[model samples]
Target chain A: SQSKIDTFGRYFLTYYFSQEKNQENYQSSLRTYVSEKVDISDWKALGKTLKSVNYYGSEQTKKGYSVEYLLNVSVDNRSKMQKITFEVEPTKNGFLVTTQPKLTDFSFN
Target chain B: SQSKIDTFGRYFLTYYFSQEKNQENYQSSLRTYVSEKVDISDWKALGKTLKSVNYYGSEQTKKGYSVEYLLNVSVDNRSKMQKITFEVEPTKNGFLVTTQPKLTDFSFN
Candidate 1:
């Protein structure tokens, strides 16, 4: 159902943004939710100030759904638009993310 | 707080994917939520199937939160990474997205 899938995606986004792998008091929040291949320690939050987010649409797959979002972020008084992708699969009650967030090559501008 | 802004973001993404402006049974669900500058007709569903979605985190503004999401989408059997930005402002009880989603130019690759 769209509800379940959306729930899973929503959780994944919240968890993703809460990551502060490189800072003090940071926890690898999605340790169990993500594939071990992701190596959560590799990412560090240099204080990401959430900014603009654009959602275009999504696609379903045999295992889950693929969604695209346009993100504008601010760091050190600067900001830029970034494209991101998330992969999710159905869980027992709802859906859960399957992979670490992936960055894309295409941009709107 | 983080809770309210998150709720607003969740609603926006759900409404965003539900759009079928180019097909039948379509309703401009966010006419009251988005800025008048955003023309919903400029986009069409093309039958989007929900897929991967990634969440990073958010920053607090005077009004709401700025959030970024990574979306992975497949269209025509082809797939790529897309980044999304969502700007949200405070509503009565939660945050509501402000600007129309904007696409970014930078890529992780």
Candidate 2:
């Protein structure tokens, strides 16, 4: 695993989470870190809030690697657990996440 | 002039115009015909009514060639002439538009 990729994942998520709650700049801010495959808006609309995000780790994949994160979300204020895996592609510029991210309900929940 | 490229340019504009009028699938459609760098979301949040689009012609560029177009656009019901130039890089796939598009007021009143 590239520590460089690890750092990039952390930084990318920093902006990802930072802009999650920002309505005016959410999509625009997220635009900088992701490709067209990535959704600009939160999958959870309005009342579906992202409570917390914890970086799980990175795993190698064909295109690049998957950066896993554990997200605590609230759907209409009902707490729920979610797992997300962002696909990152390495580039001369560093790392770019251009593919659609994977999502699922946490089995541990 | 490569007839193949001309065909591609025409096809791309066809998709481009289609998506511009298509608010629901605006960005999605354009994504198929352009590079990830091309800002397919330009007209998504705003409505720039395209009255008509006429192909001006094509010219060679450092990267490849510039496909030109003369577009009649309306903003707030006011009609205006808009000129756009798309820079394309030719590949086995015909072409790929990776550079930032060049825009300006159309020449000739």
Candidate 3:
């Protein structure tokens, strides 16, 4: 009954705001949680800075998990609060998260 | 240099607002302008009503084309103006468009 998302969920969400200088390193960190099937190239192009990230909760799916979080992201000199849900599963490598759907909603806060 | 988007672009843009009763048929019409590799399942789930759609313009890319358009889409009883860019290529089977990215932005009208 142990979900990988429950264990490494915070780490996965925090990695985006880790202030890593190398773009490739940030991308690699993202890949650690992101599903292999997805291409993170477009994400790299976003160039949005993660001002802050907060853990909300999780939802249990039949196959795996859906971790919810709030991200304070800044893009184009504007910052917005975004709700993100990371679909994850326990794999041989760790928690395999999906970044395909990306952020769900953004609101003024 | 003739572009498939230039020829069938209007038809492709209009298809969403064509008021087709069958969801499958509407999806089929979408596939005519959508790339084969992309999936239309999530779009089918959105249950958005297309009030209208207008052709904005296009940009020529090295590989093919990026046609821009404005869509009047209603979801959850709320209407929104969505800006969409359909990446298209001239294939043997007419213009093959990429739907992976989906809509770019939805703005207030």
Best-fitting candidate, scored by DockQ: 1
Pairs in clash, predicted candidate 2: none
Worst 10 residues of 1 chain A by lDDT: A100-109
lDDT of 2: 0.64
Better of 1 and 3 by TM-score: 1
Residue A22, model 1: lDDT of: 53
Q: Which candidate do you rate higher for DockQ, 1 or 3?
A: 1
Q: lDDT of each model, Cα atoms only?
A: 0.59, 0.64, 0.64
Query: Going through the candidates in order, what is the number of backbone clashes in each?
Result: 45, 0, 1
lDDT (tens digit, per residue) of candidate 1 on A12-52: 56556664655433436655566554566655554665565
iRMS of each prediction in angstroms? Answer: 11.4, 21.3, 19.5
Best by TM-score: 1
lDDT tens readout by residue for model 1, B24-107: 334365554555555655544545444766665687667666787776656678766666687776555334567667545436
Candidate 3 chain B lDDT trough over 10 residues, lowest sum? B100-109
